[PDB]
């Protein structure tokens, strides 16, 4: 195709849409050797969903400062906001950092940090994952006596997981204003509230930039689903084989689908019970965040013969189910993820940052 004939089609047709205008090449391109500052340890994560802010982070103990930058083509990429991530947290590792946005509620971003292995002798049998939500700098503004200017705050919490759970940044952040965290002993949904409830009808660290407020005011609410209690309740009622069962060792939980409107999240649960012999299942449980748990599938019983490959075969089944049951989500209502593994393409704004 062309671009000029595409413009004529737009003029006489009135259906200009970036869905059909997607396989068109991005225009503006830089090697990031002309607009970058410190002429630092600024590793550039990637653009926002809007296209104006660019994010970067500096490791430099390690420190991990996070930086929102305002963009400009002819003039400078001006640094707007610098924020300290995970204060009063003893950090030791390289920390693969992953930042994400909510689908619609774009007033705050969320960032997770995962290392390679824990150091509590460095325990190989643990992993430290950190989380913190931080507000985005409000561009349209209008001494904290003005209301719509104090859109800046912070909430961080560190946890350890035990064989390791799966990062899932499309379903954990599909419900707006709520984050889902698989703590490997529980599943926790955290909801923040600025000034009527997004909850039923771990302990956090909240901060503004450095201070520590009291729990335009902000309140948090967290709901927490414990795996052992729900496994015992689902076995005691929905188990066509559950009489030879005695105990259970290990389980992995994958999130299949999160319905925001019904406030329900589907969790596949790959259990290792004993019934005796080593036996595995693949349960399915629907969780209703508005009040409670409902069963969907209490599946079969199966003998294991490879160690650990039960989990990879099981997660192969989970991605087989989700890749079968996908509905292609829209632009706008999707979750963007920025992570640099150690080029930034804003395909909407057609900007290339080659490295």
């Amino acid at each position: 195709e062309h671009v000029l004939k595409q413009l004529e089609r737009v003029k006489i047709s009135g259906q200009l849409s970036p869905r059909l205008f997607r396989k068109l090449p991005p225009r503006v391109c830089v090697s990031l050797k002309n607009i970058v500052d410190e002429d630092a340890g600024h590793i550039f994560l990637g653009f926002s969903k809007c296209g104006r802010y660019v994010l970067s982070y500096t490791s430099s103990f390690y420190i991990y400062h996070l930086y929102w930058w305002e963009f400009n083509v002819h003039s400078k990429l001006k640094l707007v906001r610098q924020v300290r991530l995970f204060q009063d947290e003893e950090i030791y590792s390289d920390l693969y950092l992953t930042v994400c946005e909510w689908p619609s509620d774009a007033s705050k971003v969320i960032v997770f940090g995962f290392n390679t292995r824990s150091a509590n002798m460095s325990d190989e049998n643990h992993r430290d994952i950190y989380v913190s939500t931080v507000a985005v700098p409000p561009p349209g503004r209008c001494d904290p006596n003005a209301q719509c200017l104090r859109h800046g705050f912070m909430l961080h919490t560190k946890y350890q997981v035990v064989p390791f759970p799966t990062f899932q940044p499309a379903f954990q952040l599909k419900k707006d204003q709520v984050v889902l965290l698989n703590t490997s002993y529980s599943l926790v949904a955290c909801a923040v509230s600025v000034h009527s409830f997004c909850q039923i009808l771990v302990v956090t660290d909240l901060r503004g930039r450095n201070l520590r407020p009291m729990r335009q005011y902000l309140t948090v609410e967290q709901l927490t689903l414990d795996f052992e209690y729900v496994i015992n309740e689902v076995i005691r009622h929905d188990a066509t084989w559950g009489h030879q069962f005695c105990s259970f060792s290990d389980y992995d939980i994958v999130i299949l689908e999160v319905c925001p409107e019904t406030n329900q999240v589907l969790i596949n649960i790959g259990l290792l019970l004993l019934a005796p012999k080593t036996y595995h299942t693949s349960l399915k449980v629907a969780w209703d965040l508005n009040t409670f748990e409902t069963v969907s599938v209490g599946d079969l019983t199966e003998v294991k013969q490879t160690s650990g490959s039960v989990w990879s075969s099981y997660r192969k089944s989970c991605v087989d189910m989700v890749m079968k049951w996908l509905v292609p989500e829209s632009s706008g209502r999707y979750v963007n993820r920025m992570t640099n593994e150690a080029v930034l393409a804003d395909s909407e704004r057609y900007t290339w940052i080659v490295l």
């Binding site: 004529e8 003029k11 509905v327 292609p328 829209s330 706008g332 057609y350």
Partner: protein, 774 residues
């Protein structure tokens, strides 16, 4: 703090769709048309189409189909808006109380599907059981048509193809089988409403060729479907396969169809070149049963480029165009002197694509007289609309007009005609039809040196403002492409010049790499090129900036001084600038994805950071700047007068217009702003005060609880700013048709609405001057 008032100086004229049936009663052949929000009901009678009503829906009507359930005497109506409001409406005529009674209404957005590429497809089961809707990819919205007490519990069925071209409910199968074409292969399915799922429908899936686009469900008794598109017209039903590939259907894609005989014996096919085909099905008995022998298509002639076709009685068809003029056309049973079984009867006028307009003063007296450009391929025409009511004189060009401007010195019009020619090995390439460029008095090709497609010949026509014939056609060179045009005086010259922005686009590359700015004069019968300048890139938009020419190349806005030696000279390079508006010293550059940008004399001033695709922008005053985007909206963003807070714009006024606005032009037909959309609508934006804005706002909130709507669509929902990312109520704009409809209600309804201000006749006063600017 910015207040504007938008009113419709011309209701949209382009036909968005048409349906036929016994709607007003059981016995009267109603023809229903949807023009972009207006549902115009007609009764076929002896003198012709006697128009009954014009019911105005609050939405862009995208699905409009007539279905009759069992036990209903006459047809009900199902309308779906393009904002996913659905309604089922029953006519009721008691002497004069025409009451279009809504029966069903509700929102069918699901907010997590994505918009499918080909469009909304609404289909009704031929035994009235349920309604199928492809709104989103990978999903099928089914509404059961049950009459129990209140609900119609619609649900979804996960279609597993994620790219479906066209889907039809099929005929005569004992359970309702859909039949679709996915990206291509034809599949069927059989819907199970009791369990709400697809079942493997009978007549398993087959392959078709990749440009197939239309599925037609043939009625009883034939069963099965026809798949049409690009020399592939294939009937399929189970065992039965049938194909045909004539050379006639190759040239252009068939765009609509209509069923002539009620048992599917013959069909009507309209395509992009405006031709007309009669698709013929032949019967055979082989006994009892009835089968299809052999398909044949038969041409009928040429009509206007049809968006919807419709056969009406006694051999007349309603060619309901979207680009150009709609038609009632008689099908002659006899031939003609060239092989045309179609003869024209009534040419319903339509503006259609208002690509651009410059409001000029033809005679005198400062009364605005709009000269818009219109049409797409063979029905491009200059429409001259003046206030009366609105008389619209049509000058057909038979080729595409791109932009126009007015050179009042020689009393002439410069316009950009782009005709499509089809290549051959015979010579270079010879055109299709006799058009305006081919019928010129004196033409000249540009003489400056410097198989599956179609070439574009781009010309400047110069057109007299009194007689509107053509005077000279300047044809640009091979693979040249004129984009933008401006008429102005430059430098200290005494004479006015035409300035055209041509590019050289090539089939092998998407991005253009060379173009030239060419400057002509008109020496009273001769168009003489006085300047040319070869620029590396395409010349996208050109504007006069205080005797200097502010050009825009690919992303480089340059400025040109017009030197004394008749030559153009560059000044600077600031780095898709495609709209350039100039109020004195400011420049409002609207990038396609850069929202808006300002410039001064190039010291940048402010920008906007918002996901938009600017169809056009406008400089309202030096503070407020007004843009229309491709999500069918309007928004105004002021300039706040803190250096980061100085280099920023704030979107203060949001308004879901419902149109795709191709051009803004300053002026007034009777300052104000005309916007000329792509449904032919011409609209007016006026600035306001603060207290008048609050007056009209509170009057409108008291008016919305009284003037009931059709389909119960909320006026706070139809006008609320809705793009794909977010939704929010409308601020900073006043829907002028809601307030102009105040004066047409009854006097008890006039005195019932207010109750909380002085009197009521004063409102009758104030609205009666708001109409005096149309």
């Amino acid at each position: 703090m910015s207040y504007n008032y938008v009113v419709t100086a011309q209701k949209p004229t382009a036909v968005n769709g048409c349906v036929t049936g016994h709607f007003t009663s059981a016995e009267d052949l109603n023809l229903l048309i949807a023009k972009n929000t207006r549902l115009e009901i007609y009764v076929v009678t002896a003198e012709g189409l006697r128009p009954v009503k014009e019911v105005g829906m609050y939405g862009k009507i995208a699905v409009m189909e007539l279905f009759r359930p069992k036990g209903e005497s006459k047809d009900l109506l199902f309308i779906l808006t393009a904002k996913y409001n659905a309604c089922i409406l029953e006519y009721k005529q008691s002497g004069e109380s025409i009451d279009i009674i809504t029966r069903a209404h509700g929102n069918v957005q699901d907010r997590i599907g994505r918009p499918s590429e080909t469009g909304i497809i609404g289909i009704i089961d031929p035994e009235c059981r349920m309604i199928g809707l492809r709104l989103y990819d990978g999903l099928f919205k089914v509404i059961p048509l049950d009459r129990d007490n209140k609900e119609l519990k619609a649900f979804n069925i996960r279609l597993e193809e994620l790219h479906v071209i066209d889907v039809k409910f099929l005929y005569g199968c004992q359970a309702p089988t859909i039949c679709f074409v996915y990206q291509r292969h034809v599949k069927t399915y059989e819907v199970s409403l009791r369990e709400k799922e697809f079942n493997k429908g009978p007549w398993k899936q087959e392959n078709v060729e990749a440009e197939a686009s239309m599925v037609i469900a043939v009625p009883e008794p034939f069963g099965g479907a026809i798949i049409i598109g690009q020399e592939s017209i294939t009937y399929h039903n189970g065992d039965k396969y049938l194909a045909i590939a004539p050379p006639i259907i190759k040239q252009s894609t068939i765009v609509c169809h209509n069923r002539v005989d009620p048992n599917g014996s013959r069909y009507l096919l309209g395509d992009m070149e405006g031709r007309l085909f009669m698709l013929l099905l032949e019967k055979e008995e082989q006994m009892g049963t009835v089968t299809l022998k052999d398909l044949r298509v038969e041409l009928l002639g040429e009509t206007s480029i049809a968006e919807c076709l419709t056969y009406l009685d006694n051999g007349v068809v309603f060619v309901g165009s979207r680009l150009g003029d709609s038609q009632l056309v008689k099908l002659n049973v006899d031939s003609n002197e060239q092989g045309s079984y179609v003869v024209a009867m009534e040419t319903f006028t339509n503006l259609g694509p208002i690509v651009d307009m410059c409001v000029v003063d033809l005679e005198r007296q400062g009364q605005g007289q709009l000269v818009t450009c219109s049409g797409a391929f063979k029905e491009g025409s200059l429409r001259i609309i003046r206030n009366g009511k609105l008389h619209i004189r049509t000058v057909p060009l038979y080729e595409s007009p791109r932009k126009i401007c007015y050179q009042e010195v020689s009393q002439c019009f410069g316009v950009l005609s782009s005709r499509i020619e089809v290549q051959d090995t015979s010579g270079g390439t010879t055109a299709l039809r006799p058009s305006a460029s081919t019928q010129a008095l004196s033409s000249s090709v540009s003489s400056s040196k410097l198989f599956g497609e179609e070439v574009e010949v781009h010309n400047l026509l110069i057109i007299d403002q009194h007689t509107f014939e053509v005077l000279h056609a300047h044809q640009f060179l091979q693979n040249e492409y004129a984009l933008s045009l401006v008429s102005c005086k430059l430098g200290k010259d005494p004479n006015t010049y035409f300035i055209v922005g041509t590019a050289m686009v090539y089939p092998e590359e998407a991005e253009p790499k060379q173009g030239r700015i060419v400057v002509f004069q008109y020496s009273d019968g001769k168009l003489q090129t006085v300047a040319e300048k070869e620029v590396k890139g395409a010349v996208y938009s050109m504007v006069e900036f205080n005797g200097k020419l502010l050009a825009s190349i690919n992303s480089t806005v340059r400025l040109y001084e017009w030197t004394t030696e008749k030559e153009l000279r560059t000044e600077c390079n600031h780095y898709m600038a495609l709209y350039l508006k100039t109020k004195g010293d400011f420049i409002l550059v609207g990038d396609l994805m850069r929202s808006v940008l300002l410039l001064a004399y190039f010291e940048e001033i402010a920008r906007d950071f918002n996901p938009n695709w600017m169809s056009a922008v406008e400089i309202l005053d030096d503070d407020n700047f007004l843009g229309a985007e491709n999500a069918f909206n309007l928004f105004v963003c002021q300039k706040d007068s803190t250096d980061e807070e100085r280099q920023h714009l704030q979107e203060v006024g949001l308004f879901h217009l419902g149109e795709f606005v191709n051009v803004f032009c300053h002026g007034s037909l009777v300052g104000s702003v005309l916007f000329g959309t792509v449904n032919g609508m011409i609209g007016l934006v006026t600035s306001l005060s603060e207290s008048w804005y609050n007056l009209l706002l509170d009057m409108q909130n008291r008016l919305n609880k009284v003037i009931k709507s059709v389909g119960k669509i909320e006026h706070s929902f139809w006008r609320s700013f809705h793009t794909e990312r977010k939704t929010e109520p409308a601020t900073g704009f006043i829907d002028g048709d809601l307030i102009e409809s105040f004066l047409d209600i009854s006097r008890p309804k006039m005195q019932e609405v207010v109750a909380n201000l002085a009197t009521a006749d004063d409102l009758i006063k104030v609205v009666e001057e708001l109409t005096r600017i149309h």
